Design a protein around this nucleic acid. Structure first.
Ligand SMILES: Nc1ccn([C@@H]2O[C@H](COP(=O)(O)OP(=O)(O)OP(=O)(O)O)C[C@H]2O)c(=O)n1
Ligand SMILES: [Ca+2]
Ligand SMILES: [Ca+2]
Length: 1203
RNA sequence: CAUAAAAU
RNA sequence: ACGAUUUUAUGGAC
């Protein structure tokens, strides 16, 4: 010991002060009881001093009302945990209560008649605790609501009633409006937004009245949203609060809403680092099958959770061997991942959302203090989250000069533990010190070792996947001639051997069968194991009696349930979730392992609203059964949107849309808009007329107009529109116009490849004295290409990227374009290509069949613009299959040149920069794909690659004409690699031009033939291009002026001037809706209409069937409806707190899929997979369904919000 | 993959 | 015998 005093517990269990704070204030007073107590009071206020320097951004909010008087209180603290401690609840309650009767408003008066008690609590708790906001509200009627303790509101209303103010109070907590009426916004607070935003618009060049009217309309909006009155009432968001009030003759005097920790920043905490940051101040000085164990750390803010995780790491490092914001450390027998548990709600969330489960927590309390009041709430988290085991690490034991005092702390924590049903008497407890360990000290250092032993020994080894009874979630079901039914999926756990019997359980009543076999794409297997994608064959059972969503499992091991309790997390707006709350009868979709299943739910007694961001317990009952046991995770969905996650906590027992309205909309959709003449053109001219631009004289001018690259952006925007809008219209009369044009072009490109083939094959001119830019780039480009690409396409590469994913082949028309028919019907293949097919055949037990072995592809024609079609090439199926292989590998490799072919936004953005800086140019070639000659390829690519490219192309072509060509080009568009190969050729030449001019290669960026490189380089690029056979398109390439375009976006001095195109004669209501939408999107800023165009929009709107004028959807939901405000829409049905609106879709008949083919396709894909917040990982890929498109239209109801 | 919208 | 690539919204995600 050290003390002339031993029993400090009496001092403690009447103060709540730390053990040492106790024995030190006792030692220094000869050891007098009532005396020491007082001595501590004094020293108290001074300890709360370092508290101030602790950001207390948590806490609670309280509200009390007495007939007419109501007050709302906000008192802060540092954690979730103390926020729900009884102690802290009492203080805040008292301050609340003793602030109602004594109607206080001056915070400071309140913050002062309590200050002596404040320090009292702080001292005990050891956390900063400051009272904060306080306000009062009086009204002829007022009511309150609070949302747990995170948000409280006061609502005051005249001429209102009781239920009515509950509801408004709930709404205020949901939509947090700043003002009570749109007219309350400081007639100046806004005037700023209007002087500032009138320029935003006037600087686009929009003529005053236009920018003015837009900013006016824009602000009318800006105001109504942030004001109670013009906010869609959350309990029925079709009518607003203003309108809601007025139907109750009611008015709202005013409202208060406080939210815990509003406008307190709260510097973020990165745990993983914070720890590694201490493992530095001291670290300076097959057996890969070890089980993964997840541990959490949890305790008082400054008791040492972090410094301990350091010690755990340095020491385990020194001694033994050696998804974010965690740490991992290694034990000779196990592997650990370790999270901190800094808050109760944050943890509960992560444990729901599977983003941090726990095999055991380690509870860290400092022995100098002993357990704190809120330690109880730490342990309570453990119990509520179901942590299986809790180990205790007593910390800072050196600063305790009396062993018997350690015995005291130790026994307090054993009681709290047992108070919450944990094994108190048997729980490992370690008297140690984090500090001494990290600063080296075998003594205290061996205690960390002792704790880690307690991890290896006390936390039981978690059951390995393969050791659990077999379960495979069923993704699809195939009837296969002369084999029977096979299901596919990834086996979730265990092992299934052929022979063994299986139960199939889920949607319908359970069934039994026996495993006839198990197969993957490559081989047949004896057994399927955990984590393997397989097909499983079943005896007897017919295909029509198995559904996706059911499971396959060892009998009696899993059961079908409909009712159950769960813990769930509703995602925030900010996380792509819902943006509005739900209530009693929420009715979403519950996605289990592989399928949605609808279900109702009942909230827990006392909660009536749920908002994005909430944790919540709810009782879900499903419309039909699903195989579950507690532990099972599921997602919450609204029309394929994920808005929640949950886990089944305990299985229980337990067990809208319109007709005519639907029918009316369909009738209308199937109608035909009728007009005199060319409706597209009428719209276009009316549009030009509203913008003070001259109309189109004739069909012939529509396609022969050129914009002026100058003028203000606004004046250029409609002008360019004018030149683009009708430019691809396929229904013009006047024109000896054909596709004769396309084939002439097709013949011209071949003739150029002919020339360049002759040319380029001739490396020695006459006498080696004369040097050329073109020659030099080919030499430079080549060298670069080889370092990027290798001598040869790898087997790994090809095995990862070869696939069918298609449309039409030389054997299958578009009807049979789906990959599954490629595996079903035999595909053609080229003489040189035959080896590749043979190799596929020797790699699998399934039949791989060649239809006919020929050198030909089919040259055909597809629409392009009003002036010409464009010829493409339908390849032999097996050729395509491998072409996609090298296509896929070049895609991977091009990433090192900072070129990313799965993303055209990097080209769009550099197009934009270019229109501002003029330092980047956008360049276009003409028949780009058709101009890559054989010769150019053989000089640029490694021989190995070239041979592989030459095996894989179609060497010959067959025109619709009936004639043939022997291709002078390497390949055309339609071929599986053409596009990546252009990219490579174009990039390598441009990059070579950069080196030669002393510019960064990395400034080069390419997407097919949209090319962007520094402007200075264009003249030389033009020269190289001429040399190697390309013709650059002067009209589409810009290395100066204010205009740039790349990948479909067009810019003029930074402003977007991307046009829209009317491609077809408009006949159905859907066609009209397409055009009006494209016009919406072109002429709208943030939903607000440029007025010039709005007049045209309204005019042609009238052409639609009456009902389709009102059927509106938000932007970003397609074109089966007019884009506009969906809250206004009369056809929207709000069913179960999810809003559903009708949209026109293409009507389709069902069609027979190919069973083997689809099954092959399925397995082939799973193979592909195997060789190449974050809770998306609860969904899959979908069963193949073929369908024919009739030309009628159908109406379909879809979920939508406003995102 | 693809009906659909932009697009190379 | 309308294609190869990207992409986003809807549906093969009942
Ligand atoms: N079925 C198709 C059609 C086009 N493309 C790709 O588009 C690229 C270039 O074509 P565009 O840039 O759109 O224009 P071009 O047809 O080459 O000619 P122009 O600019 O004169 O219209 C190359 C080609 O691989 C393709 O891969 N497959
Ligand atoms: Ca081009
Ligand atoms: Ca282009």
């Amino acid at each position: 010991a050290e003390i002339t005093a031993s029993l400090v517990k009496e001092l403690r269990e009447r103060t709540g002060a730390g053990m040492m704070d106790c024995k030190k204030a006792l030692t220094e007073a000869n050891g007098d009881i009532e005396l020491a107590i007082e001595n501590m009071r004094k020293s108290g206020a001074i300890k709360a001093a370092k508290k101030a320097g602790n950001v207390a951004a948590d806490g609670v909010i309280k509200t009390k009302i007495d007939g007419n008087y109501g007050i709302i209180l906000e008192v802060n603290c540092q954690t979730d945990f103390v926020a729900k401690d009884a102690g802290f609840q009492a203080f805040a309650d008292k301050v609340l209560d003793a602030a109602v009767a004594g109607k206080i408003t001056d915070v400071e008066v309140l913050k002062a008649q309590f200050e002596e008690e404040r320090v009292a609590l702080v001292a005990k708790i050891g956390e900063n605790i400051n009272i904060r906001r306080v306000a009062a509200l009086e009204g002829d009627v007022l009511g309150s609501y609070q949302h747990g303790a995170r948000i409280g509101v006061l609502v005051a209303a005249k001429g209102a009633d009781e239920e009515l103010v509950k509801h408004i109070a709930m709404h205020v907590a949901a939509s947090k409006p700043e003002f009570i009426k749109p007219e309350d916004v400081s007639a100046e607070v806004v005037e700023k937004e209007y002087q500032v935003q009138l320029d935003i618009a006037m600087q686009s060049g929009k003529p005053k009245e236009i920018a003015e009217k837009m900013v006016e309309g824009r602000m009318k909006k800006f105001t109504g949203e942030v004001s109670l009155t013009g906010q869609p009432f959350v309990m029925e968001p079709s009518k607003t609060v203003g309108q809601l009030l007025k139907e109750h003759n009611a008015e709202v005097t005013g409202f208060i809403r406080f939210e815990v920790g509003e406008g307190i920043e709260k510097v973020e905490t990165d745990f993983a680092a914070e720890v590694a940051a201490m493992s530095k101040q001291s670290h300076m000085s097959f057996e890969r099958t070890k089980p993964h164990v997840n541990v959490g750390t949890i305790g008082h803010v400054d008791h040492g959770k972090t410094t301990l995780t350091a010690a755990i790491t340095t020491v385990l490092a020194k001694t033994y061997g050696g998804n974010t914001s965690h740490v991992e450390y290694d034990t000779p027998t196990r592997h650990y991942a370790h999270v901190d548990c800094p808050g109760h709600a944050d943890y509960v969330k992560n444990m729901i959302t599977g983003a941090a489960q726990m095999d055991g927590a380690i509870l860290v309390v400092a022995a100098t203090d002993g357990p704190m009041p809120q330690t109880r709430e730490h342990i309570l988290l453990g119990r509520q989250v179901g942590v299986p085991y809790i180990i205790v690490f007593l910390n800072k034991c050196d600063m305790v000069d009396d062993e018997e005092l350690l015995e005291l702390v130790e026994m307090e924590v054993r009681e709290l533990l047992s108070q919450y049903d944990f094994p108190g008497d048997d729980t490992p407890i370690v008297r140690g010190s984090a500090l001494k360990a990290l600063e080296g000290d075998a003594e205290w250092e061996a205690k960390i070792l002792e704790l880690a032993g307690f991890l290896d020994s006390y936390i039981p080894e978690p059951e390995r996947a393969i050791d659990k009874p077999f379960l495979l979630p069923i993704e699809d079901v195939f009837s296969i001639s002369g084999r029977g039914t096979v299901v596919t999926g990834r086996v979730e756990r265990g092992i299934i051997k052929v022979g063994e019997e299986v139960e199939i359980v889920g949607i319908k009543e359970t069934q039994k069968s026996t495993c006839t076999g198990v197969e993957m794409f490559r081989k047949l297997l004896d057994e399927g194991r955990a984590g393997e994608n397989v097909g499983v064959l079943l005896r007897g059972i017919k295909r029509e009696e198995i559904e996706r969503g059911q499971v396959l499992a060892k009998p009696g091991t899993i059961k079908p349930h409909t009712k159950f309790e769960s813990e769930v997390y509703i995602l925030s707006k900010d996380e792509g979730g819902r943006h509005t709350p739900f209530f009693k009868g929420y009715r979403p979709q519950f996605y289990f392992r592989t399928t949605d299943v609808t279900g109702t739910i009942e909230l827990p007694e006392g909660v009536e609203m749920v908002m994005p961001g909430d944790n919540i317990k709810m009782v879900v009952t499903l419309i039909h059964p699903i195989a579950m046991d507690d532990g099972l995770r599921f997602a919450i969905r609204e029309g394929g949107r994920t808005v929640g996650a949950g886990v089944v906590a305990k299985v229980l027992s337990g067990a809208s849309s319109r007709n005519s309205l639907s029918a009316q909309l369909r009738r209308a959709a199937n109608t035909r808009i009728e007009v005199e003449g060319n409706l597209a053109l009428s719209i276009a001219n009316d549009l030009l007329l509203a913008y003070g631009q001259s109309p189109f004289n004739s069909e012939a001018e529509c396609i022969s107009f050129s914009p002026r690259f100058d003028g203000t952006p606004d004046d250029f925007r409609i002008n360019y529109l004018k030149a683009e809008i009708m430019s691809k219209y396929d229904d013009f009369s006047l024109g000896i116009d054909t596709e004769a044009v396309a084939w002439e072009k097709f013949l011209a490109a071949e003739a150029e490849c002919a020339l360049t083939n002759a040319r380029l094959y001739r490396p020695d001119y006459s006498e080696d004295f004369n040097f050329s830019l073109g020659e030099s780039c080919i030499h430079m480009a080549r060298r670069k290409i080889a370092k990027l690409i290798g001598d040869v396409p790898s087997v790994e590469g090809m095995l990862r990227h070869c696939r069918f994913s298609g449309g039409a082949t030389t054997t299958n028309n578009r009807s049979y374009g789906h990959p599954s028919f490629k595996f079903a019907l035999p595909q053609a293949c080229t003489p040189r290509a035959l080896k590749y097919v043979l190799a596929l055949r020797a790699s699998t037990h399934f039949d791989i069949r060649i239809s006919d072995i020929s050198p030909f592809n089919k040259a055909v024609t597809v629409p392009k613009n009003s002036k010409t079609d464009r010829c493409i090439a339908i390849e032999p199926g097996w050729n395509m299959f491998f072409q996609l292989g090298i296509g896929g590998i070049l895609r991977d490799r091009l990433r090192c040149w900072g070129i990313d072919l799965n993303d055209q936004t990097i080209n769009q953005r550099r197009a934009h920069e270019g229109s501002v800086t003029n330092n980047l140019a956008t360049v276009d070639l003409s028949a780009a794909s058709d101009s890559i000659s054989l010769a150019l390829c053989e000089l640029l690519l490694p021989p190995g690659w070239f041979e592989v490219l030459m095996d894989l192309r179609s060497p010959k072509g067959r025109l619709p004409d009936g004639s043939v060509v022997t291709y002078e080009k390497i390949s055309s568009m339609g071929n599986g690699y053409t596009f990546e190969l252009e990219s490579l050729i174009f990039a390598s030449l441009a990059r070579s031009v950069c080196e030669i001019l002393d510019l960064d290669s990395s400034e080069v960026t390419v997407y097919g033939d949209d090319i962007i490189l520094p402007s200075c380089a264009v003249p030389a690029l033009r020269e190289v291009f001429k040399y190697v056979g390309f013709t650059t398109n002067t009209k589409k390439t810009f290395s100066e002026g204010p205009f740039r375009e790349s990948c479909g976006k067009h810019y003029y001095s930074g402003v977007d001037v991307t046009p829209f195109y009317i491609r077809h004669r408009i006949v159905s209501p859907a066609d009209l809706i397409l055009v009006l939408n494209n016009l919406y999107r072109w002429a709208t800023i943030d939903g607000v209409w440029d007025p010039r165009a709005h007049s045209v929009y309204l005019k042609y709107r009238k052409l639609l069937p009456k009902q389709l004028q009102r059927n509106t959807i938000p932007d970003g939901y397609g074109d089966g409806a007019l884009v506009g405000s969906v809250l206004i829409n009369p056809f929207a049905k709000n069913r179960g707190w999810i809003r559903y609106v009708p949209v026109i879709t293409d009507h389709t008949r069902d069609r027979e899929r190919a069973e083997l083919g689809s099954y092959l396709y399925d397995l082939f894909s799973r193979c592909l997979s195997e060789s190449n917040a974050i809770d998306q990982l609860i969904c899959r890929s979908n069963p193949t369904k073929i369908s024919r498109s009739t030309g009628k239209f159908d109406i379909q109801y879809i979920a939508c919000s406003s995102r």
